[PDB]
Amino acid sequence: PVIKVRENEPFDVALRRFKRSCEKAGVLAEVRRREFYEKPTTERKRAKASAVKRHAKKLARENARRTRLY
Amino acid sequence: PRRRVIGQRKILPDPKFGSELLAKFVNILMVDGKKSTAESIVYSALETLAQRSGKSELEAFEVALENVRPTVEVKSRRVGGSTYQVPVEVRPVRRNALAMRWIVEAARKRGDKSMALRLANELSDAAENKGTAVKKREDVHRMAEANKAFAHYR
Amino acid sequence: RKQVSDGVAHIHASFNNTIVTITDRQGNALGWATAGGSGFRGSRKSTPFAAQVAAERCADAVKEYGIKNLEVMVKGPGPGRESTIRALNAAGFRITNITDVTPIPHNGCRPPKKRRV
RNA sequence: CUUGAGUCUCGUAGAGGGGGGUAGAAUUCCAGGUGUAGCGGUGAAAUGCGUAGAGAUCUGGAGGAAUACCGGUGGCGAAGGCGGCCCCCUGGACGAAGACUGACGCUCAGGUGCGAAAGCGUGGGGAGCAAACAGGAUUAGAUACCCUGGUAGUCCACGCCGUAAACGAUGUCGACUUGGAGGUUGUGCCCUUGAGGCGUGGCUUCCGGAGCUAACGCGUUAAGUCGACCGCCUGGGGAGUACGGCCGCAAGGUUAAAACUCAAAUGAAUUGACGGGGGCCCGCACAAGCGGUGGAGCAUGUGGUUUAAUUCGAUGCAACGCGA
Ligand SMILES: [Mg+2]
Ligand SMILES: [Mg+2]
Ligand SMILES: [Mg+2]
Ligand SMILES: [Mg+2]
Ligand SMILES: [Mg+2]
Ligand SMILES: [Mg+2]
Ligand SMILES: [Mg+2]
Ligand SMILES: [Mg+2]
Ligand SMILES: [Mg+2]
Ligand SMILES: [Mg+2]
Ligand SMILES: [Mg+2]
Ligand SMILES: [Mg+2]
Ligand SMILES: [Mg+2]
Ligand SMILES: [Mg+2]
Ligand SMILES: [Mg+2]
Ligand SMILES: [Mg+2]
Ligand SMILES: [Mg+2]
Ligand SMILES: [Mg+2]
Ligand SMILES: [Mg+2]
Ligand SMILES: [Mg+2]
Ligand SMILES: [Mg+2]
Ligand SMILES: [Mg+2]
Ligand SMILES: [Mg+2]
Interchain CB distance below 8 Å, C50 and B151: no
Q: How far is the CA of C61 from the C1' of D262 (A)?
A: 83
Task: Report DSSP state, residue B3.
Answer: S
From chain A, the residues in CB contact with C104 under 8 A are 27, 30-31, 34
DSSP three-state, residue C15? coil
CA A44 / ligand 11 centre spacing (Å): 12
Contact C102 A32 (CB under 8 A): no
Report the C-alpha gap between B64 and C91 in whole angstroms: 37
Q: How far apart are CA C100 and CA A46, in angstroms?
A: 29
* Phi, psi at B86, each rounded to 5°: -105, 140
How many Cα atoms are found within 13 Å in the side-chain-facing hemisphere of C74?
28
- Subunit contact C49:B148, Cβ cutoff 8 A: yes
Nearest to B146 by CA among B79, B67, B86: B86
DSSP state letter for B6: -
- Amino acid letter, residue B128: E
Domain residue extents for chain A? 1-56
Q: Which residues pair with B138 in a beta bridge?
A: none
Residue B46 and residue B122 in contact, taking contact as beta carbons nearer than 8 Å = no
Q: HEC profile for C80-111?
A: CCCHHHHHHHHHCCEEEEEEECCCCCCCCCCC
Q: In angstroms, how far is D7 C1' from C96 CA?
A: 74
Q: Quick check: B68 and B103 in contact, CB under 8 A?
A: yes
- Between CA C24 and CA B55 the distance in angstroms is 62
**How far is Cα A38 from Cα A35, in angstroms, rounded to an integer?**
9
Task: Name the closest nucleotide to C104, judged by C1' and CA.
Answer: D26
Selection from B48, B88, B41 nearest residue B64 by Cα: B48
Query: Rounded to a whole number, what is the distance in Å from the CA of A55 to chain C's nearest CA?
Result: 29
Distance CA C20, CA A8 (A): 27
Output Rg (C-alpha) for chain B, integer angstroms. Answer: 17
Candidates B92, B95, B91; CA nearest to B70 is: B95
C42: left (phi over 0), alpha (psi -120 to 50) or beta: left
Instruction: Measure Cα distances from B114 to B108, B119, B120, B127, C46 in Å.
Output: 10, 9, 10, 20, 52
Q: Which residues of C touch B149 (CB under 8 A)?
A: 40, 43-44, 47, 49-50
How many Cβ atoms from other residues are within 10 Å of residue C48's Cβ?
A: 21
Contact B150, C40 (CB under 8 A): no
* CA-based torsion, A48, A51, A55, A57: positive or negative: positive
Is B99 within 8 Å of B69 (Cβ atoms)? yes
Could you give the CA distance from residue B47 to residue B124 in angstroms, rounded to a whole number? 12
* CB contact A19 to C (< 8 Å): yes
Residue type, B118: R
Resolution (A): 3.0
Determine contact: C115 vs chain A, CB below 8 A. Answer: yes
The H-or-E segment that residue A58 falls in is helix A40-59
Method used for this model?
A: cryo-EM
Q: What is the per-residue burial (b if ≥16 Cβ within 10 Å, else e) of B3-13?
A: eeeeeeeeeee
Phi, psi angle pair for B104, to nearest 5°? -65, -45
